[PDB]
Every structure is written in C-alpha cells, then in structure tokens.
From Swiss-Prot, chains A, C:
F-type ATPases have 2 components, F(1) - the catalytic core - and F(0) - the membrane proton channel. F(1) has five subunits: alpha(3), beta(3), gamma(1), delta(1), epsilon(1). F(0) has four main subunits: a(1), b(2) and c(10-14). The alpha and beta chains form an alternating ring which encloses part of the gamma chain. F(1) is attached to F(0) by a central stalk formed by the gamma and epsilon chains, while a peripheral stalk is formed by the delta and b chains. It is found in: Cell membrane. The chain holds residues 56 to 110 of 164 of the full protein. The gene is atpF. F(1)F(0) ATP synthase produces ATP from ADP in the presence of a proton or sodium gradient. F-type ATPases consist of two structural domains, F(1) containing the extramembraneous catalytic core and F(0) containing the membrane proton channel, linked together by a central stalk and a peripheral stalk. During catalysis, ATP synthesis in the catalytic domain of F(1) is coupled via a rotary mechanism of the central stalk subunits to proton translocation. The lineage of its organism: Bacteria, Bacillati, Chloroflexota, Chloroflexia, Chloroflexales. It comes from the Bacteria. This is ATP synthase subunit b. Belongs to the ATPase B chain family. It comes from Chloroflexus aurantiacus (strain ATCC 29366 / DSM 635 / J-10-fl).
UniProtKB/Swiss-Prot annotation, chain B:
It is found in: Cell membrane. This is ATP synthase subunit alpha. It comes from Chloroflexus aurantiacus (strain ATCC 29366 / DSM 635 / J-10-fl). Belongs to the ATPase alpha/beta chains family. Keywords: ATP synthesis, ATP-binding, Cell membrane, CF(1), Hydrogen ion transport, Ion transport, Membrane, Nucleotide-binding, Translocase, Transport. F-type ATPases have 2 components, CF(1) - the catalytic core - and CF(0) - the membrane proton channel. CF(1) has five subunits: alpha(3), beta(3), gamma(1), delta(1), epsilon(1). CF(0) has four main subunits: a(1), b(1), b'(1) and c(9-12).
Length: 55, 127, 55
C-alpha cells in the first residue's frame, strides 16, 4: 500500500507542481512583457522630459 | 514605518555587545542581530541616488515587517535597487497611491497595505 | 524511494521553472536596456539639434 500510494501521490503531486510551474511560467512571461512595456514608457517619458528641457 | 525601524536598530545596538559570541545566542537574539544587520545594510546608500519618499516608505515597510529575513546580508543593497526598479516599472500606481496617501493619520490602510504586499510578493517570486 | 522521487521530480520542475523565468527576464531586461540606450542617444541628438538651432 505504501509503495502504490507513494508512487501514485508522487505522480499526482508532480502534476500539481507542473500546474504551479505553468502558472509561474505564465507569470514570468507576463511580467517580462509588462516590464518591457514599462521600460518603453519610462524611456519615452524621459525622452519627452529631455526634449522639454531642451526647448 | 520608521518608529519600529528605530526600535529594531536600538535593539541591534544594545545586542552589539553579544555579537562577538558564537552559538551562545538564542533564536531571539540571533534573529534580532540578523534584522539589525539587514537594516544597517539597507541604510547604506550610494552617492547621488536620492529616493523619493514613497520609495523610502515602501522599502522600509518591506524591510521591517519580516519580508526581508530570507535575503542574505551582502545582497540587500542590490535587492533594494531591484525592488525600486520593479516598483517604478511594474506598479507606478502603487507608488502614486503611497504618495497621495502618506499624509493620512493611519498610513497602513487596507488598500495600500494589500497592494504593497502583493507587489512585494510578486517581486520576490520573480526574483 | 518513490516518496523521495516525488520530491526529486518536484525540485527538478521548480528549478526548470525558475531557470526559464530568470533567462526570460534577463533577455527582456537586456532588450529594454538596449532600447533605453537608443532612446537616450536619440534624446542627446535632439538636444544637440536644439543647441544648433539656438546657435
């Protein structure tokens, strides 16, 4: 019983951890996209500030 | 966020005498010394790098309410810089909410508290 | 052994997820840094153009 249950729960918790890691990977991709967008926006704001300073 | 920081730094100064001993300090004293060293490393700031008040209060909230013990001491400065960059990029609205909600009598309101804590959790996960 | 293998597989999955997230974040950060440097150079060129206009 211990062997069977250990193997079965091992596979099931592996699947659960795979789901958690899928959520983690989705979070990583979304955060990379959001950080790229935020870096672009901040660079645009900085360039606008530099242009206003130049004017 | 600074009254408790002052308290913790005071206990660190008080316990600085015991820091020479190794393994003779209980869990409480070792934890207090670690917190004090972490806070001291956090105060270390490079030249020509001012922090707006919102960034200051966010950093101190992160450091003092047990969200920083796991981080090792040598890397706390980089942790702070990374966290501030994350805030300036990820959630500028969080910093704005801190800024316009700093005058209030009871700053740790539920909305700012939960938003800031979520930001810290997301940053630590991404780390 | 199976109970330990459960933890082994979970750890491997966690490591894979973390490594993927770190690599993606590093690549995105490098791209953002390059874009920010380009925007800063464009701002410097615009400032030089403004100085030329003033001259």
């Amino acid at each position: 019983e211990q062997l069977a249950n250990a193997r079965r729960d091992y596979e099931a918790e592996i699947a659960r951890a795979r789901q958690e890691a899928a959520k983690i990977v989705a979070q990583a991709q979304e955060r990379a996209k959001q950080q790229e967008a935020e870096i672009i926006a901040q660079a645009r704001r900085e360039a606008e500030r530099l242009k206003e300073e130049a004017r | 966020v600074a009254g408790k920081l002052k308290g913790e730094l005071a206990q660190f100064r008080d316990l600085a005498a015991f820091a020479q001993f190794a393994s003779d300090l209980d869990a409480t004293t070792k934890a207090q010394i670690e917190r004090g060293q972490r806070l001291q490393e956090l105060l270390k700031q490079p030249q020509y790098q001012p922090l707006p008040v919102e960034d200051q209060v966010a950093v101190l909230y992160a450091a003092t309410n047990n969200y920083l013990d796991d981080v090792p001491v040598p890397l706390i400065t980089k942790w702070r810089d990374d966290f501030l960059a994350f805030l300036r990029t990820a959630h500028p609205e969080v910093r704005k909410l801190i800024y316009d909600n700093r005058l209030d009598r009871k700053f740790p309101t539920p909305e700012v508290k939960e938003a800031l804590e979520a930001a810290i959790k997301e940053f630590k996960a991404t780390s």
